[PDB]
Amino acid sequence: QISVRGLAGVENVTELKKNFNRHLHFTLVKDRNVATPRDYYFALAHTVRDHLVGRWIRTQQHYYEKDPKRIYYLSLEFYMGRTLQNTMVNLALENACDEATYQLGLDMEELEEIEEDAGLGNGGLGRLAACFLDSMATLGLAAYGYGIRYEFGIFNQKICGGWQMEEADDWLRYGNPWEKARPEFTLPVHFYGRVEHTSQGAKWVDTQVVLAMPYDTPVPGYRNNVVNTMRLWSAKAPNDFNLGYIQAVLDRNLAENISRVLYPNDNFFEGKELRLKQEYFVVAATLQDIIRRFKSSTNFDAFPDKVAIQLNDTHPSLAIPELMRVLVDLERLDWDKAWEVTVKTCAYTNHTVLPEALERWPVHLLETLLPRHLQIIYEINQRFLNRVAAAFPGDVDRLRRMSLVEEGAVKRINMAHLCIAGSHAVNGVARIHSEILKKTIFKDFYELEPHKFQNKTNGITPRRWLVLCNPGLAEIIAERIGEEYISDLDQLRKLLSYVDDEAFIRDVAKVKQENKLKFAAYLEREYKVHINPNSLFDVQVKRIHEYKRQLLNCLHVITLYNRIKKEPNKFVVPRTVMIGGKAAPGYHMAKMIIKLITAIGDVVNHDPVVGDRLRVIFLENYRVSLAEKVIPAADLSEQISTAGTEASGTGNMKFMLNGALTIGTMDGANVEMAEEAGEENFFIFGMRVEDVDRLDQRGYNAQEYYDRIPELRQIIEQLSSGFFSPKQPDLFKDIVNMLMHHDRFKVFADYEEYVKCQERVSALYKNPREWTRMVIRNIATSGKFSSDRTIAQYAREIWGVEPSRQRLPA
Amino acid sequence: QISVRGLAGVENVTELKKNFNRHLHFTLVKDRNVATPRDYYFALAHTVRDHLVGRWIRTQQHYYEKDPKRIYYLSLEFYMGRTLQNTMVNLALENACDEATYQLGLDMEELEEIEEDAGLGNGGLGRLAACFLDSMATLGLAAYGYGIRYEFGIFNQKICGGWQMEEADDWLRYGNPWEKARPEFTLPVHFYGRVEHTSQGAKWVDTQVVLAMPYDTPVPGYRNNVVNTMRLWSAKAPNDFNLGYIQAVLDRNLAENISRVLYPNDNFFEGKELRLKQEYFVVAATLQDIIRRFKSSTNFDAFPDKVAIQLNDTHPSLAIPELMRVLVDLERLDWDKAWEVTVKTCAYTNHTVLPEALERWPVHLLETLLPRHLQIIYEINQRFLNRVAAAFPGDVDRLRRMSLVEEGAVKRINMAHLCIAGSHAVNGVARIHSEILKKTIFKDFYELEPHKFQNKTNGITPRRWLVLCNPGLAEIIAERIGEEYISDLDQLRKLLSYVDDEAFIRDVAKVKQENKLKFAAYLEREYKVHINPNSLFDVQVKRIHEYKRQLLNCLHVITLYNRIKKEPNKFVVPRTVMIGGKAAPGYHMAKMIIKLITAIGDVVNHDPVVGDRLRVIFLENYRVSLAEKVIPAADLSEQISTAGTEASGTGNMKFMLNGALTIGTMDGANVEMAEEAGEENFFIFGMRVEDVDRLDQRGYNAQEYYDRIPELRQIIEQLSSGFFSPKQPDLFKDIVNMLMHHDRFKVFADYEEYVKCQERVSALYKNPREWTRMVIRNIATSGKFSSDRTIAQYAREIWGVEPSRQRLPA
Ligand SMILES: CCCC#Cc1cn([C@@H]2O[C@H](CO)[C@@H](O)[C@H](O)[C@H]2O)c(=O)[nH]c1=O
Ligand SMILES: CCCC#Cc1cn([C@@H]2O[C@H](CO)[C@@H](O)[C@H](O)[C@H]2O)c(=O)[nH]c1=O
């Protein structure tokens, strides 16, 4: 069908069809009279997985023989999504399977829709993990993702009467054809117990044992025959466990609960024991696996030349005292030497500066659960604070600020402080974010060790986020410049000499129109909701958080509605405003925000005066596979975090890649996107970081905006008075209250400039042709935002390994 | 190698080898450098399972087209053991795989040893289920086993300092290649709630929902290409379940605990809620599956002509009120008609008369858990007691004795009474057992409905219990008479004209000698224990229970030991006495018995005066696959239950089939075995049933035996005084106590006659040739004890279907 989806050679198609029928008969134990479309999905999925395995085995073999430095990416989240289409794209099988399945009388696309998302993440942090893995394999690095195999991932979101309801995400119900259980590599992990001191050193004893059983998932590189491994641990009880006989067997579940469920908090710390067990679990089991692999090559000086461990935020920060524990207590190296190895091995990536998101573990927790690690942490803190003392003599306030140990109410360990002390490199995830670390929360650490601090601006994989979700756009780009851009995204610059080409202008507009027709139809079929496809598609999708200011967007929507009612017969550029995202379960304000959005939709969508000029849709169950549909269909990308709060953002990059214009604050990667496209090709508004700081020190008084801006006062009164909630007049008193008296994110301060920048957007949209040329200018400069670039920088500047675009033999 | 294991045709062997390598590469994702013998087992197992599936699909299809009456065997236990070798035997693949694996440089036998037993049963009742399934498939009946898929089966037994220790049997750890999950046929099952009465009839509401997910296991017939289905249900939570978010997800395990673990009590009732949930669960989910299958053929008069449900004891007795519930509350048939259908559909098999084993459920339990079923039960009891009243007017004591409802302390439902009332046929499991039912516990029910009562003497499958475990013996039998006996065991009679053939005598003795050498070597390799293979192998293996009188055997062993010490230089026929079996966890006396046995072994096995004349070995972890090794190696089979307590026994049959002589009481099937072999070819001793009854009514006084039998007094004093437990002189005071004052099983009363019958055994053993001719006479008359005969009788006399030895096409 389309040229970027590979060859459909007669030999391949005939071969695919017979393996499909074999799996249906032998693996699935069905015949064609009883098979449902789900069985068809599995047969296709098993048939596609056969193509990986040979490559997977050879790649693991090549690494054994060639013995390169290995990268270990430790993360509590891997937000993978579906694997089938991605696997086909990376093996060039897409058109062959399309053809093969067509001939069997099946629709491949209808089959793809049956696959469950692997939702083993919350949002951006877990999704960066997934892009990173795809990029490591594409660049031929000998790289292993390590995490937890959660039985339940991020919950499924349902809306009932405008409120979010949470349902268990039972993603394994039908089986997962992508994983291979490896019970032969089960490893013990210890908890509780106590520390004995001997002649021979410390010993950790009387521990409970949880077993960690690994599951391997293949991660294929783009068309290079590399297939790396994502290893996820599952918790299993030992067999003498407790060993009522009955009750002892039933209690085996208290051990296995460690890997049962992903914690649904995003940018918010919760200090729960079960979460700490999860953190230790992945770290303890992964380090033994790493040491084991290293011993099959006694002399640990070469350890840092054979091993890099990346920490995906502070979730796996216990890797640091754990590496020490093993090195000092079990291998019996002296402190100083183990410490050199540790620092040289480990590196730390920070993903936020929000105070409520940082990990600070109560000492009484570590004390019970991990008494040895606490001793090690105390020792680390003591020797660290002696370097600080020595370099800044007499500065006693520095010592209390830098301490890994926080005093006060209950003593806590600051886990970020631990990571900085124990890593040779620390990085933020966009340039402005990295500067903020150096200027604010990590300032003291920077003056002590400037050479640790770096930036590695985030990116996204152009395989999932362009080829896979947007084949139409990929195809027209490939007609003009070839296919090489898919693994070298900088090549999109060449699209700049097509900015005045009339055929290209029309092709970009045509693709966008198709994606919108397809998305509108998906809204009607799967959610009985009616949208006008000629409207501007104004979309904000990401987790629900006050810092992301979904509330700012709400105020704009209500403003547009009020203007329509004031002058009904005046022309306005019509929009569909879509907003989506999950709220963490205990986060009451986020849940109120979701309810406000649908309340606004109840009023606006049923006003006959509005017609099809304005539509407000809340997109249910936002997740990876829903992003692959809505992103290509969007015209305006909303990236409107208060400046200084969005560390980087990655959705922003998804939208730029796929031909939507961006309205955004100078926050996070937005600053670098605008700089790449040129600020003229970007809808920038609102306070900079500097302005936010000026307003803080003076005092943020919301009443001031409410007094000076009549459009805003009318919205607040409408909110206060029951206009959007006629049966519960006082439903939104929490929101108005926070807006008026405790807004940490200054929603009013950006309101005026946001509404005005929004009119500039509608104006550009009235001129289809200039809208599209600006789109071409975005797409054409999105190259920097490939995770291949991000990973090459990690490889050269942190891991000390060289990337490779070379094919391995087939 | 041996002719009964099929052809090894060049085409088959070449084909087997390539599928083996395919599975190793594609299913297991290993290559030959990294594979361990466990991977080899799996590759063989997957390669063998491919041969079933085509047959499995065609058999399920044939039943759809031909629409015969279906048999449903409902049981809480399926004691399957290993599947690989059995599968090869039934498909005639054994020598081909042997050859195929030989050429790949593997030992098939070493591979077979890696398979976990499916220990989803306790002992004889669960094992009869397994023989029955094999026989139903061999006889071409359209028959389905239904049960629970336990995550943990009967516990693994370890001995630590002579005491039993219990370990979780984690049989699924590595996966089960034999089962196919079928999550598409998940069914809801209800609990708790309450009953509402409407205009329209009763409604059961406000229930908790547990989902039942089915797993299908193939059951292949012998060489006839029939492959039937064993369907086992797993408990799953619904997704809105509880829906802390965290805690709600973790609590999903309270629902799934239903299928977590098999209750380890054998011949002992425990009234625990979790057990009742298990019973309802299998019954509720199986009946919907049955009704569903029946509707794909509204008029329920034909239901009994399309469906038979066998109840494997009273465990699934709730099938009766449940069938009523569905028929009356959901299909809205009137009471009388639903009741006719129910009785005509259901039949009940009783497996014991022991009072402590019978199920009597406290009403307060059914009331909370199954309020509707209780109402239905009350109604059943009322209409039943009106037939009784009408047929025996004024007999008020009969009414209290026959009531499904027992009065007293706490009210209970007698589940046996329910089964008799609601079934068209009730059967015991051996002739004497069936007469006892008619004369004692079910006498009143018999006078009301004589036509319900039948006998169906148990049997065992000659495929597992001869061909599979004893190929040597099968081969020499086949040389003389052909192969047809394997599915027509009555043909072994022909062996009678070989009783005076010198070559046959030597071949039978030679096989026995081989099995003993092989078993002795298995004892040294796997348990570092040293045995003399020229000794008589005296074996008692079965669950540990006072009724089975392992204690009687102990007294004999101690007697032999004391005779040796009295006259050390007198010749005695040397023996290895092996005793094995599991004790239920809370059954203190059974655990004392195990400890006594090993205590006897500590003394006897280290006395230099004894030499290798007497050895006492306790066989650890007795289970199905350990039975397939020890049974063919045995000379004397010990079947020594007090007369009237062993309903049938089936081990007894295993041993007769495999060339051991039997020492036994006239109990259970022993009566019919002796009658088939001739009492001269059998070592019968002790009280008959009549004698036991005479002693009861007079009073059993143990002191009397202790006063008259000096050999016995010496054993008791030795026990009392610390001879067998030097460090805890009083260790066995519980045993001596029970023996002296509360023996419900009259161990002393049979002691004298047992010791004397034992000397007669040693005497016959001194003359190898006459020992062997007696063996030939046993083997040759074991035909009656084929479960094919048992099942043909169930088919003709209860189910109303005709068996079929016809091959289905390949
Ligand atoms: C203990 C660690 C806590 C921190 C954090 C988190 C950061 N990010 C996102 O991480 C994404 C990947 O770097 C960024 O693009 C985005 O700006 C940022 O909010 C998340 O999506 N969730 C988080 O919990
Ligand atoms: C509620 C039902 C209770 C009863 C019973 C049981 C019977 N049998 C055995 O069932 C075997 C199969 O019929 C017999 O050979 C044997 O004599 C008998 O003890 C068991 O092995 N376990 C039992 O629990």
Write up what this structure looks like:
The structure is a homodimer. With about 800 residues, chain A is of the alpha/beta class. Chain A has 2 domains: about 1-460 and about 785-810, Rossmann fold (3-Layer(aba) Sandwich); about 460-785, 3-Layer(aba) Sandwich (Rossmann fold). The longest helix of chain A is centred in the first third of the chain and has 30 residues, at about 35-65. Chain A is globular, with a radius of gyration of 27 Å. Chains A and B meet through helix 2, strand 6, strand 7 and helix 7 of A and helix 2, strand 6, strand 7 and helix 7 of B. One ligand D1J binds near residues 123, 351, 359 and 649 of chain B. Chains A, B: Allosteric enzyme that catalyzes the rate-limiting step in glycogen catabolism, the phosphorolytic cleavage of glycogen to produce glucose-1-phosphate, and plays a central role in maintaining cellular and organismal glucose homeostasis. Chains A, B: Belongs to the glycogen phosphorylase family. Chains A, B: One of its GO terms (molecular function) is pyridoxal phosphate binding. Chains A, B: Its EC number is 2.4.1.1.
